[PDB]
Amino acid sequence: ASNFTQFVLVDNGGTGDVTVAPSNFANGVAEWISSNSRSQAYKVACSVRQSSAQNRKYTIKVEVPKVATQTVGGVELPVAAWRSYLNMELTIPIFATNSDCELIVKAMQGLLKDGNPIPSAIAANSGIY
Amino acid sequence: ASNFTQFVLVDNGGTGDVTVAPSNFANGVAEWISSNSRSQAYKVACSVRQSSAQNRKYTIKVEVPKVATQTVGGVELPVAAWRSYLNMELTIPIFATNSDCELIVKAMQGLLKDGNPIPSAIAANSGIY
Amino acid sequence: ASNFTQFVLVDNGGTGDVTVAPSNFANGVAEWISSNSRSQAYKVACSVRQSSAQNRKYTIKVEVPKVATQTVGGVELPVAAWRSYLNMELTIPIFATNSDCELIVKAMQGLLKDGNPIPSAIAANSGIY
Amino acid sequence: ASNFTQFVLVDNGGTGDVTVAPSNFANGVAEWISSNSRSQAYKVACSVRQSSAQNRKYTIKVEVPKVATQTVGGVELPVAAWRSYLNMELTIPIFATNSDCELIVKAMQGLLKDGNPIPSAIAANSGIY
Amino acid sequence: ASNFTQFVLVDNGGTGDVTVAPSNFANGVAEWISSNSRSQAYKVACSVRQSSAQNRKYTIKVEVPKVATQTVGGVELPVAAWRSYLNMELTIPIFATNSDCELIVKAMQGLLKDGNPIPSAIAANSGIY
Amino acid sequence: ASNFTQFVLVDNGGTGDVTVAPSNFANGVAEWISSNSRSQAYKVACSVRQSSAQNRKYTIKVEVPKVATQTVGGVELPVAAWRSYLNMELTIPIFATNSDCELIVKAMQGLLKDGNPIPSAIAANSGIY
Secondary structure, three states: OOOOOOEEEEOOOOOOOEEEEEEEOHHHOEEEEOOOOOOOOOEEEEEEEOOOOOEEEEEEEEEEEEEEEEEEOOEEEEEEEEEEEEEEEEEEEOOOOHHHHHHHHHHHHHHHOOOOHHHHHHHOOOOOO | OOOOOOEEEEOOOOOOOEEEEEEEOHHHOEEEEOOOOOOOOOEEEEEEEEOOOOEEEEEEEEEEEOOOOOOOOOOOOOHHHOEEEEEEEEEEEOOOOHHHHHHHHHHHHHHHOOOOHHHHHHHOOOOOO | OOOOOOEEEEOOOOOOOEEEEEEEOHHHOEEEEOOOOOOOOOEEEEEEEOOOOOEEEEEEEEEEEEEEEEEEOOEEEEEEEEEEEEEEEEEEEOOOOHHHHHHHHHHHHHHHOOOOHHHHHHHOOOOOO | OOOOOOEEEEOOOOOOOEEEEEEEOHHHOEEEEOOOOOOOOOEEEEEEEEOOOOEEEEEEEEEEEOOOOOOOOOOOOOHHHOEEEEEEEEEEEOOOOHHHHHHHHHHHHHHHOOOOHHHHHHHOOOOOO | OOOOOOEEEEOOOOOOOEEEEEEEEEOOEEEEEOOOOHHHOOEEEEEEEOOOOOEEEEEEEEEEEEEEEEEEOOEEEEEEEEEEEEEEEEEEEOOOOHHHHHHHHHHHHHHOOOOOHHHHHHHOOOOOO | OOOOOOEEEEOOOOOOOEEEEEEEEEOOEEEEEOOOOHHHOOEEEEEEEOOOOOEEEEEEEEEEEEEEEEEEOOEEEEEEEEEEEEEEEEEEEOOOOHHHHHHHHHHHHHHOOOOOHHHHHHHOOOOOO
16 A cells, blocks of 8 residues: 555546645645646645544645636746645544444535535635525 | 425434424524434534625534444433534635526535545545545 | 515414514614504514524514504694514524424413413503412 | 412323322412422423513413333432423513403413424524424 | 615516616615626615705716727627716705605606606607707 | 706506606706605705715615605695605716617616516515525
8 A cells, every 4th residue: 555646636537637645745635637737737635633632634635727828927837827725624533433434424525516505616716695 | 485494404314314404493594303312313404694795604513423332312421422513614706696596506515425534534434644 | 495585473363463574684683663654663683693603592572562543743643652662682592493482482472372460460460470 | 360279280181181289389489390400390380570660570481290210209410411491471561451361371372382483493492484 | 665676677577677786885875786797787775865954965877888899909799889977865854754755756757757758768869949 | 968857766556656857966966856745845966976086976865755744733735755865876988889888777676676686675674585
């Protein structure tokens, strides 16, 4: 094993899928980036720390860029028009069993599943109502 | 539309699924909880707001109960030993079209898909290695 | 669902029943008022907050007006001679199950049921003896 | 009359009803408790007094035990995790006739009638939405 | 019940209609935004407040954008070339019955009905003459 | 040609309609007043002005009276028991073509169309919920 492997971040059904690969583990922060210039890359970062004596906290960050080509000084450079940022922190008690943890993972998957309230609001630029 | 509806948070295959239903809307913050006491409930909250001149921010909070050795309806202390807390913040530039937003949703779904590093680490009480 | 619906506050047996309808949810305070000028309306307000870390507190307020017509400046205005105010605060531990909560609701109904001590004292302008 | 009598606080249909009986009258405050230890009892207290020159005020307090997972006759700590507290204050202007007062009683009964928003929110561990 | 819902702001007869959906109800200010880029979206905000002892005051705001694409350095962004701003304040004494309010609403709709002086001056970049 | 004419402010379907007729156009402020006592009359005022270099600003005002008779010392006078005041300001950049203006007018009519959130809250003495 080694769970530090590449995965497809954006599944565009085989064509134009955005895959992200391991790229750095310096300072205990596991990082993954897509095959682009570092200026236009998708980026995922993950780190876990025993925050309290009885908790562990995972900090996960994703950056989704809007790619563009910009003319600076009469020269064109690969750039990102803007970036969207996802920041998540998960605190799990040390008393959580593996099956307790699987429950947290399933809850996070159901939350974002297609057609459920939240992913629907986000995708439509609206709130919950 | 009208997305404030009940949904399946934990999909256990039809048998033993955890459904979460609307429970509060005070202050534009939509809340959903499972059919349990509030100390043992699965809880989801969501709200959007223009965080700055250039961004909108979605704050999503989830609480998941530690189920192994749980006593249904009992008084379980300390509260912190029996609950996991998820905190997500999604910042999206005001230029993001619905399409851009659909892609951000896919990135979140890919991140947590089964078999991918992050959800596998969490489920196994591990970090990256 | 949406429990924010209209209900009959004073059941005068089909004729002259006082019904109250949703009228505002600003600041997380659910409000209901009767179809009158705002000066002569019945008013119900409800809000819940996690008062302590282990409690939740519901604050409910009802205002029953005594309607009158008053001549101010030689002009008649719809007015309330006086108002009676009900103020209730219910503190429920987070460890309370739904069935535990149903017990609280039944207790509150029995308390005010016709012929029981309290509603009898109130209706007769006396104390308990 | 003489209203200080035993009554059914929780009506469970004849089987498993909670009856509450007079238990104290120190200081003009009528008290009723169920047949349990004082830590697990259903308790009701009531008193009236002229709060001001223009009003009389009824203070009614109710305590309801958390029953799910309860150990009858046992020592259950912390006390706050096992009890709900109701606090009602009814202010009535000195001009209110018996009829006016009967109407105030009906308003209180309508507020808590089954199926109405408030009692439904409470029973479901919810707020308004 | 809820009136914080989606609605048609610009009726372009079934197609090309501008719909505005609820987005956020923070601090007593209900806000609605149309879909797609927040930068090119229409916006409606509304709030009510007791302006004085006898008055309640509504504050409505609407923004109509002039959709355009901004190109800078070869990077183009969806923007509003400019915006038209409507700010209205409606004061209503607490003596107004529902019938009085309905009349106030009719006066507002009549003021803007097609063919009347005001909507015709505006639609033609003109004043009164 | 002239748009400074009489028009129906409150359409009560042919009968009981409130018509407002031109009264005075002094200092760039066009004013319309309904017939009979000026004290019980409806009033509409409108003016446009170049608010800045790029903007033109319309200022519309409407007054809805609550008709009543004042009696003092046996002398009765026709008065308005009170008035409801509407003050609106519409800013439009000088780049707006007639098509843009027509759209702005449609947005205003849609905002107040029957059944939509805003006109329904007002007509019912309510806020958003």
